[PDB]
Amino acid sequence: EYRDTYWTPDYVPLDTDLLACFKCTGQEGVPKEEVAAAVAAESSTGTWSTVWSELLVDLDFYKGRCYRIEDVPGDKEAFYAFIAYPLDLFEEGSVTNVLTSLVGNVFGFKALRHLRLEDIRFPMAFIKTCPGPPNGICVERDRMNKYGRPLLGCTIKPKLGLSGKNYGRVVYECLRGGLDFTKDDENINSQPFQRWQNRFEFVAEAVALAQQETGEKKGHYLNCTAATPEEMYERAEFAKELGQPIIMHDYITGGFTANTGLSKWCRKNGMLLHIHRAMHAVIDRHPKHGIHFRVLAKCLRLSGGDQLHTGTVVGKLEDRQTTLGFIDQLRESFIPEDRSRGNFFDQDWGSMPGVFAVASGGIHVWHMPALVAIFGDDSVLQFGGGTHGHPWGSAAGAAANRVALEACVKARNAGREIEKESRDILMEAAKHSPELAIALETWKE
Amino acid sequence: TVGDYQTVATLETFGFLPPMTQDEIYDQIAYIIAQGWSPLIEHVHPSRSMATYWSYWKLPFFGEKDLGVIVSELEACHRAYPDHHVRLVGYDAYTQSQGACFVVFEGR
Amino acid sequence: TVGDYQTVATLETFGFLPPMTQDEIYDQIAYIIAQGWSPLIEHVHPSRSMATYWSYWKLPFFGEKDLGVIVSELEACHRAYPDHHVRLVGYDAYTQSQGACFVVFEGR
Numbered sequence: 137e138y139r140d141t142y143w144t145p146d147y148v149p150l151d152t153d154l155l156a157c158f159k160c161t162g163q164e165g166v167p168k169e170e171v172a173a174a175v176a177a178e179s180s181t182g183t184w185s186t187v188w189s190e191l192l193v194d195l196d197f198y199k200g201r202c203y204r205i206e207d208v209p210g211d212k213e214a215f216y217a218f219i220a221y222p223l224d225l226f227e228e229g230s231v232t233n234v235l236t237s238l239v240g241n242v243f244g245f246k247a248l249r250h251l252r253l254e255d256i257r258f259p260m261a262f263i264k265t266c267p268g269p270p271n272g273i274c275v276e277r278d279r280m281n282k283y284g285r286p287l288l289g290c291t292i293k294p295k296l297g298l299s300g301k302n303y304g305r306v307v308y309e310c311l312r313g314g315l316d317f318t319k320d321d322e323n324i325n326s327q328p329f330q331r332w333q334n335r336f337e338f339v340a341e342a343v344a345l346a347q348q349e350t351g352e353k354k355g356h357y358l359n360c361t362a363a364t365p366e367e368m369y370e371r372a373e374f375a376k377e378l379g380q381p382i383i384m385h386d387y388i389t390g391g392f393t394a395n396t397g398l399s400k401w402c403r404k405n406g407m408l409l410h411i412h413r414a415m416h417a418v419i420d421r422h423p424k425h426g427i428h429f430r431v432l433a434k435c436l437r438l439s440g441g442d443q444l445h446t447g448t449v450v451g452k453l454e455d456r457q458t459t460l461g462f463i464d465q466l467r468e469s470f471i472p473e474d475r476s477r478g479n480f481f482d483q484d485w486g487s488m489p490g491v492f493a494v495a496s497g498g499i500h501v502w503h504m505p506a507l508v509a510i511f512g513d514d515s516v517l518q519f520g521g522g523t524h525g526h527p528w529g530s531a532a533g534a535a536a537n538r539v540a541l542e543a544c545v546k547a548r549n550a551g552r553e554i555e556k557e558s559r560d561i562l563m564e565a566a567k568h569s570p571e572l573a574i575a576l577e578t579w580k581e
Numbered sequence: 582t583v584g585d586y587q588t589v590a591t592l593e594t595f596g597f598l599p600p601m602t603q604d605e606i607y608d609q610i611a612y613i614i615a616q617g618w619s620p621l622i623e624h625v626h627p628s629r630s631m632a633t634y635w636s637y638w639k640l641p642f643f644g645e646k647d648l649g650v651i652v653s654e655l656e657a658c659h660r661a662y663p664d665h666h667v668r669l670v671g672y673d674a675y676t677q678s679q680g681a682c683f684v685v686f687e688g689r
Numbered sequence: 690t691v692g693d694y695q696t697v698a699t700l701e702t703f704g705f706l707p708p709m710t711q712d713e714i715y716d717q718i719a720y721i722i723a724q725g726w727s728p729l730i731e732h733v734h735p736s737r738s739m740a741t742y743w744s745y746w747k748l749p750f751f752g753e754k755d756l757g758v759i760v761s762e763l764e765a766c767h768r769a770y771p772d773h774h775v776r777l778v779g780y781d782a783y784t785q786s787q788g789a790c791f792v793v794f795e796g797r
């Protein structure tokens with residue numbers, strides 16, 4: 137027991153292996169090969185002890201090995217440890233198992249002061265066992281008939297207080313004014329002041345009465361997060377019986393077991409799934425501890441869900457290169473290796489559909505040319521007060537964003553620089569709309 | 582009256598903006614072609630506007646690199662059907678999706 | 690003919706009584722305000738009369754203590770929509786309910 141039986145510098149990973157990257161720094165004095173070897177051991181076999189039983193098995197086959205050590209640029213005591221795991225260690229189509237194995241124990245191990253899971257390469261043999269998105273980008277655009285432009289959303293406020301009927305009152309106003317989605321807030325489950333069978337039924341009327349008046353398909357992500365899985369399926373089946381197209385779930389707080397059961401219920405029943413990344417900043421935020429959100433985005437694309445919050449837009453989450461890095465991984469089918477965007481591995485998804493990139497949290501009308509240049513067309517833009525905060529109401533507010541979005545698209549197509557000519561793509565649009573002309577005066581500038 | 586917003590019936594994309602000039606159609610068509618997509622013209626009676634399949638005209642312009650033909654194939658569909666919407670589409674063969682979809686003529 | 694009662698189509702409250710005088714609207718509005726409720730004006734086409742949501746005008750008068758403004762905001766909704774019902778509502782914020790709900794103008 138001293139390791140360097142897990143430090144294989146000559147090994148060439150198979151195409152069936154599951155690779156991983158760790159940004160690590162260990163105790164003072166111990167060489168890097170030993171401390172990365174300890175990460176190799178404690179995340180697979182966590183050994184060698186001395187037992188009679190550990191000789192009943194060929195343990196050189198199930199061992200995880202560290203084949204490369206690289207230095208973090210800009211830091212000295214840290215390093216990158218690339219570790220390879222055999223495909224036999226994991227259950228097929230189980231993402232609850234792949235994290236329980238990797239991050240289940242190594243984070244408590246004592247010799248490491250700092251450890252961060254940065255990336256994972258999944259092999260094509262593992263990807264094909266997982267369910268994946270229930271629909272994807274190209275199937276959602278088919279079912280909703282929305283082409284050539286990003287989608288628009290709003291989150292109903294006040295979060296706390298509205299009855300089932302006043303809720304549907306405010307849902308009806310934002311939809312009938314230009315948006316195509318509204319959102320249940322993450323808190324809204326089934327509170328005493330608004331039970332869920334009363335919210336579900338009055339929203340179903342506000343959606344169906346705005347779909348007919350505008351002549352466009354509209355929706356509202358109803359929150360089917362619950363305390364039990366029997367309760368979650370019950371809300372999902374209520375929502376499908378009311379004829380609704382889309383629902384919502386919280387995968388970090390409700391768990392991957394529930395998220396994957398819901399994601400495969402949506403394929404047999406033809407529903408869409410919107411995912412909220414609640415309690416992500418507890419894990420992902422600090423730059424030396426925990427998991428990067430990139431890895432929790434890959435696990436989400438593997439488990440299910442057609443849209444995922446990426447946020448956060450004030451004025452954005454901020455670098456842009458890191459964000460554009462895992463937006464590629466949510467959407468593309470093959471992603472090369474680029475260190476600037478923090479992709480440590482070449483990742484191939486084959487034919488697995490992409491996931492919509494939802495931008496959120498505090499957008500206003502002057503942010504459109506920067507959110508169309510950065511995110512592209514396979515994005516959803518969700519404001520909370522951008523729609524509701526308009527001096528004339530919630531329908532005149534939605535009518536101002538839908539005019540400023542379609543003016544930024546049609547100027548991107550025609551070869552103009554949207555993120556650079558933003559003021560004449562907007563002031564020349566307000567000449568033909570008094571709803572936007574007053575919105576540009578409020579949220580100046 | 583201000584501010585009393587009235588719900589308006591629209592098509593979908595570019596519906597909230599005024600009708601496009603001839604010069605705007607040029608640049609949208611040029612963008613559609615420069616992405617490598619295939620143009621495609623449709624039309625319906627404005628009452629059947631929410632059908633899942635409109636009506637072709639005539640076949641998608643597979644591998645057409647000239648926008649001076651599509652601006653003349655749009656007045657033909659319009660003159661032949663002067664009470665129809667005239668849509669303009671951009672077929673993407675690798676993704677099996679549509680990169681563009683906006684009504685050009687509204688239906689006299 | 691007596692006594693042959695004919696079923697009549699009504700709205701709901703105060704529907705069986707004759708249309709209200711201007712002075713009656715004063716006292717109902719004054720009662721609505723004196724309970725602490727918020728006035729709210731709606732209208733629909735008399736055919737869409739059984740919709741669950743009518744149409745606002747323009748925003749609920751949150752914290753308005755003057756009934757000389759609401760009697761003038763009722764002729765505005767009527768003149769702007771001379772073929773609509775004009776309802777008068779009283780929003781209760783603590784109970785999340787409506788303490789009043791009666792049609793004022795019937796739709797010319």
Ligand SMILES: O=C(O)[C@@](O)(COP(=O)(O)O)[C@H](O)[C@H](O)COP(=O)(O)O
Pocket residue numbers: 291293496497498499500518519520521522523524525526579
């Ligand atoms: O802080 C702001 O600027 C807003 O309140 C908008 O103000 P205005 O209403 O004055 O525009 C943001 O919408 C919310 O903070 C979060 O967004 P949301 O609630 O949409 O998720």
Ligand SMILES: [Mg+2]
Pocket residue numbers: 449450451498499500503
């Ligand atoms: Mg902002």
